[PDB]
A = this chain, B = another copy of it.
Amino acid sequence: EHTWPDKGSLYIATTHTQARYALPGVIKGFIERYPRVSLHMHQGSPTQIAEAVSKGNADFAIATEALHLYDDLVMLPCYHWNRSIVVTPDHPLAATSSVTIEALAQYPLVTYTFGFTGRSELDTAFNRAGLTPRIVFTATDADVIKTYVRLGLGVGVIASMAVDPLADPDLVRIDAHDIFSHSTTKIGFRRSTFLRSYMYDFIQRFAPHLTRDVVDTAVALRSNEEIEAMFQDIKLPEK
């Protein structure tokens, strides 16, 4: 067992979060599975990634943000995720594991810029609590964010997948699923895309519940709204 002779190309347009933290395993299995498939990848903001699929320069958009604004794409939920706050060992917050949004708003924040990786969930949580957060660094990825938390610039709020006990052993990782709604990373493609079989394999490798029949059903409805509703009774993986 290993190798399929399938011949074609696969153009993935995605973001730093996905590429760094969610895709390497899938991408490695894929390339070893499909020696005759030309894999191309492109990194960008969620909006550029979406534009790229919509303009026809990529097959699939994978991101949390922006994707829903392009109903010329069919969107498929892949997983749910939430944030951690992250601080150096000596920070005041390092002492608890009890994170009120009012406690957090006391601190200067290193997080994502508007339009990136669940930022809208953070604004929502602060706005509905009345609060106005003090964000001193609006970054576009979590490698930058963790760097400047490490320098003592402020309190990090990143995707939980962006921190690992072995990779980032010098950071204290406090869970924040209490104070923020979860975010949903989706995959998008044009309806006019002929879905090769290596594509179905890719989609399902990334999101197990997105089997061919689920995908085809989803593709048939002329509504992203209906597609979201289709998964309402299904669990989703969480990263």
Report the Cα distance A40→B27, complex, angstroms.
Answer: 36
Contact B143 A20 (CB under 8 A): yes
Contact of A19 with B152 at beta-carbon distance under 8 Å, contacts A137-B41, A138-B42 already known: no
In this complex, how many residues of chain A approach chain B with their Cβ under 8 Å: the count is 29
A53-81 residues at the B interface, CB under 8 angstroms:
none
| Option from B24, B40, B42, B147 in Cβ contact (under 8 Å) with A151 | B24
Query: Counting CB contacts under 8 A, is A230 at the interface?
Result: no
Contacts of A43 in B (CB 8 A): 113, 137-141, 144
Query: Counting CB contacts under 8 A, is A99 at the interface?
Result: no
Name 17 interchain pairs, CB-CB below 8 A, sorted by A.
A16-B140, A16-B144, A19-B139, A19-B147, A27-B148, A27-B151, A28-B152, A31-B153, A38-B136, A39-B136, A42-B113, A42-B138, A43-B113, A43-B137, A43-B138, A43-B139, A143-B143
Listed in ascending order, the chain A residues whose CB lies under 8 Å from chain B are: 16, 19-20, 24, 27-28, 31, 38-45, 113, 136-141, 143-144, 147-148, 151-153
